[PDB]
Design a binder for this molecule. Structure first.
Ligand code: K25
Ligand code: K25
Ligand code: CL
Ligand code: CL
Lengths: 325, 325
């Protein structure tokens, strides 16, 4: 398997673009940035609103938990490669504690509203709008030779009053190289593609398009998360209960993959459930034939069959958003 | 049925853009342009290479056969609306014989090579290239509220040494208005969509996308024309012998259309023929999985299901063409 687009980007670029292991970090001044208040957190970090003492501007400070040289250089390099692209969070500076040498990444500030409070208030048009903004980001990083590998609402920051969107947390991102076999332990569970769940390791940018379909589905049907599995095997089963096992089977045959026996039994046999059966009284104002058609073309087993980011931005679902632009 | 894109263009524009019947033509000087040699012809005209005596530049002169005021004002207005758009033939002047008042349209010159001689020489890449150039034209006129309604190789002029392409003959073109019922006697027979052949009159820009799929199919399989019918009923039958009647049936039910009894019998019952069965030793160098995937998404019964021009330009078939650009 190889990507159907952007496949030779890293082949054509000079090796310094992608050989992140060769990077030498140019540390900035730790004292330039002061912590004002905690605002988020995760497995690999703690995040605060900060102030740049030089200009008194707001910023975001991501203090890293102890991390391997290899891992952090990958995140920094990718962020520097993407800085300035459409709706990509901007990395402003890199600094670290002298005594402990704990690294911090410094980012632009965003007045985000957690998706559990904000998404219930979004109109039909609002949803088209914000998802179009997310696609710009994704087409950009793919075209720069990079897969995000952790798309999900928690990693999409939004200022609703300004209506501005940023794609954050580049911790799992990686450069695409034709035929390379990748680690499948990426993404977040409710958003993992079938490739990750059946151990197909030569995957590509198209993984991110599955994750986006998962997110999009949660929003129009107001059912979050859409595929609600408890573990990786159950995750594959919940998908199978909607998409159907026949297409899962044609998928495994073409890639010549075999399911763990245990897996196979849990999955079972199931007929496809059409998307209007998800429609109901709390979501009836958001489900339209164009929303469903766009969704349908993202959530496919065969990664090679999904819309690219570039194709998705042209779907008539977004026609109004494009016209306003 | 309504278009899925560009539907309100003529609604939003001032009435002078589309009310062609109100046009007052501003005739130019007949003597400015001298006939040098005949180069083409058709049902409604005769076409010559000419010279602009002022600047000694080459041009093309389209002398019209006797035509109704309504009809010619439609063609002129549409041409003036589109002049300067990507790969649209440029209308330079309009003139007429004083004694007889025979109208002539004056156009830019193109050193075209008839498709029966040129297409056999085109490489795989050449085909991607020229078809991408045709799509630019089509997305442009759709976005300007106009359907071409006669797409076909005879109406695509090409200078192979310069590799430049122009979409010509706007004689059947018309403005799109939501819900209007159109005359189905348009297009050329080998390129007519199923809508025209079953008498569905509220069709839209998507008609042109069928015609393009017909052309494209002829080129990669080197089978011209691809659907070779002798009359309108036989035309529908040849299509049915490839696409299959089941999808034809789901089509007629959704639009609530009934087939002439006579028609129904000729058509019959047929299973779909997959596109690789057309592959053979004289076309094996042009048929690729991406060519076939793109084709497949143009040739659909349901006009509402076809790719738009804008979506088609993003298909990975054209990835190399886009990169070079
Ligand atoms: C939890 N985590 C990794 C995270 N939270 C963030 C928030 Br809140 C903002 Br606003 C920004 Br900008 C970025 Br960068 C963030 N990174
Ligand atoms: C037969 N017909 C209607 C027709 N033939 C054309 C040719 Br040959 C050229 Br080159 C141009 Br430019 C245009 Br306009 C043409 N129009
Ligand atoms: Cl982050
Ligand atoms: Cl013409």
């Amino acid at each position: 398997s190889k990507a159907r687009v952007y496949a030779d980007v890293n082949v054509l670029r000079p090796k310094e673009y992608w050989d992140y292991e060769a990077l030498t970090v140019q540390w900035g001044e730790q004292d330039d940035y002061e912590v004002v208040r905690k605002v988020g957190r995760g497995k690999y970090s703690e995040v605060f609103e900060g102030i740049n003492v030089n200009n008194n501007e707001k910023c975001i400070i991501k203090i890293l938990k102890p991390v391997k040289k290899k891992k952090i250089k990958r995140e920094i390099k990718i962020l520097q490669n993407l800085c300035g692209g459409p709706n990509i969070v901007k990395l402003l500076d890199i600094v670290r504690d002298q005594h402990s040498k704990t690294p911090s990444l410094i980012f632009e500030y965003v007045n985000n509203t957690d998706f559990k409070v904000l998404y219930p208030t979004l109109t039909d048009y609002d949803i088209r709008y914000y998802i179009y903004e997310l696609l710009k980001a994704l087409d950009y990083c793919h075209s720069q030779g990079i897969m995000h590998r952790d798309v999900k609402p928690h990693n999409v920051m939004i200022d609703h009053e300004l209506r501005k969107l940023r794609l954050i947390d580049w911790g799992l991102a990686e450069f695409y190289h034709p035929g390379k076999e990748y680690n499948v332990r990426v993404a977040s569970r409710y958003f993992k593609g079938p490739e990750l769940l059946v151990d197909l390791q030569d995957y590509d940018y198209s993984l991110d398009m599955w994750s986006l379909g998962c997110m999009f589905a949660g929003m129009i049907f107001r059912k979050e998360p859409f595929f609600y599995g408890h573990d990786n095997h159950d995750q594959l089963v919940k998908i199978a209960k909607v998409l159907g096992t026949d297409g899962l089977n044609v998928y495994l045959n073409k890639y010549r993959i075999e399911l763990d026996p245990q897996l196979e039994a849990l999955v079972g046999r199931h007929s496809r459930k059409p998307w209007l059966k998800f429609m109901n009284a709390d979501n009836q104002h958001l489900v339209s034939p164009e929303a469903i058609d766009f969704l349908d073309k993202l959530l496919r087993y065969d990664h090679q069959e999904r819309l690219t980011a570039l194709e998705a931005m042209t779907h008539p679902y977004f026609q109004q958003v494009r016209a306003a632009e």
